[PDB]
Amino acid sequence: TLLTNAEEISDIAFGFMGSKALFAALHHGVFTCLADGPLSVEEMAAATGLHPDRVQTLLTALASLGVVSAVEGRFANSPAAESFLVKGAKYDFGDYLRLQVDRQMYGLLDQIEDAIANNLPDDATSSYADWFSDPEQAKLYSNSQHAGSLGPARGLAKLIDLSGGKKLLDVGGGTGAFAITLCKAFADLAATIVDFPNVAALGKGYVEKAGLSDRIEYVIGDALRTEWPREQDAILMSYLFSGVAGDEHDSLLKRAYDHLVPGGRLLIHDFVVTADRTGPKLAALWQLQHTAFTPEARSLDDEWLAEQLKKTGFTDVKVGPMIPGMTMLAEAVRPE
């Protein structure tokens, strides 16, 4: 798409408003109340403790975005709302949306005007490290991040083969949604996670809870200033490049390569744009979001990633989509 109307510009300009319609509805459990069938404005006001005129305004906004249906003064969940937004649904993720995206990201992106200029004040969150210094933020971000990564981890376990008592290193693997998943999935697979203290202390909870403190250890600290375990069969870097300065990118690949065993695989999951750089829109937007608290970030495209993977010494380099319209998966092999 290339914009033509002033209205089309307005569509983009006021997109934050629609995001906040969804977010607010989530906080007040709107889609959960609709789960048992259509409701009038007044029936909703009673179910949520909101004033009728306010719900009318909230729902009207929702209906206009297709998130709910509006038929004869009664509103109902869209199929997508029933699947993904109703509390308890197998695929529910309203909580990732309202806690991490709304409570943290929305406000945080008020920083980009300064960030894309590397003009941040000191009283701004300028890194993951700085941000996570606040344990209750670290826990707020991780807890939803974890929840959100479980699905993609499963999809991941279906492509790669870690069978054969192997060793996994997840650099920046947070609270362990990917390692925990790949370990439960693969026989005799052991894993290390490199992540910051406050995050690491939270992962240790998720890992002991899974009953896997025998197979999964944290090397705690800043990955860039902390020794990794060498001779690993597989390295996972998921949303690491995005939250890391762009000058680290080359030496990040060299290190991954150096810490691999011959035939070892490197796995990079992240917001990646096509090389023509016209999308995918969700990934480009998320690159920007990360830049808000990572002013030195750069933009990963699939071509660049391919080429630098090869010039690092990797072979069998492949790049494909993971989270539809949002992330990609790059696979690399240190040669046998």
Binding partner at 91 among ligand H9L, ligand SAH, its own copies, none, C-beta below 5 to 8 Å by kind = its own copies
Taking CB under 8 A as the binding criterion, the range among 83-91, 179-187, 200-208, 224-232 that sits at the site for its own copies is: 83-91
Do 44 and 75 touch, CB atoms closer than 8 A? yes
CA-derived radius of gyration, the chain: 22
Q: Rounded to the nearest whole angstrom, what is the least distance from the CB of residue 149 to ligand H9L in the complex?
A: 5
For 223-286, the DSSP string reads GGGSPPPSSEEEEEEES-GGGS-GGGHHHHHHHHHHTEEEEEEEEEEE--B-TTS---HHHHHH
Q: Which two tokens stand for residue 202?
A: 């939270």
Give the burial string for 203-230 (b: 16+ CB within 10 Å, else e): bbebbeebebeebbbbbbeebeeeebee
CB nearer to ligand H9L: pick between 32 and 287: 287
131 binds ligand H9L (CB under 6 A): no
- Number of Cβ within 10 Å of residue 180's Cβ equals 26
Measured at the CA of 166, the angle between CA 249 and CA 195, to 5 degrees, comes to 40
| Residues 112-151 interacting with its own copies (rule: CB under 8 A) | 112-113, 115-118
CB nearer to ligand H9L: pick between 261 and 282: 282
- In the set 29, 94, 174, 264, which binds ligand SAH (CB under 6 A)? 174
Taking CB under 6 A as the binding criterion, the range among 49-57, 71-79, 148-156, 203-211 that sits at the site for ligand H9L is: 148-156
CA 263 to chain centre: 28
Do 234 and 167 touch, CB atoms closer than 8 A? yes
Contacts of residue 214, Cβ cutoff 8 Å, sequence gap at least 6? none
CA 278 to chain centre: 21
CB nearer to its own copies: pick between 97 and 330: 97
Residue nearest to ligand SAH (CB): 172
100 binds its own copies (CB under 8 A): no
270 binds ligand SAH (CB under 6 A): no
Binding partner at 137 among its own copies, ligand H9L, ligand SAH, none, C-beta below 5 to 8 Å by kind = none
| Residues 240-269 interacting with ligand SAH (rule: CB under 6 A) | 240, 243-244
| Residues 153-192 interacting with its own copies (rule: CB under 8 A) | none
The SS3 assignment for 290 reads helix
Residues 86-105: x where in contact with ligand H9L by CB under 6 A, - otherwise, as a string:
----------x---------
Instruction: Write the DSSP symbol of residue 167.
Output: E
- In the set 23, 25, 32, 195, which binds ligand SAH (CB under 6 A)? 195
Phi, psi of 101 (to 5 degrees): -70, -50
Which residue is associated with the tokens 């969940």? 77
d(CA 151, CA 177): 9
Q: Which two tokens stand for residue 152?
A: 């993609």
The SS3 assignment for 79 reads helix
- In the set 23, 75, 96, 196, which binds ligand SAH (CB under 6 A)? 196
31 binds ligand H9L (CB under 6 A): no
Q: Rounded to the nearest whole angstrom, what is the least distance from the CB of residue 190 to its own copies in the complex?
A: 32
- In the set 108, 224, 288, 322, which binds ligand SAH (CB under 6 A)? 224
CB nearer to its own copies: pick between 91 and 254: 91
Residue numbers of the site for ligand H9L (CB under 6 A)? Answer: 96, 145, 148-149, 152, 239, 323, 326
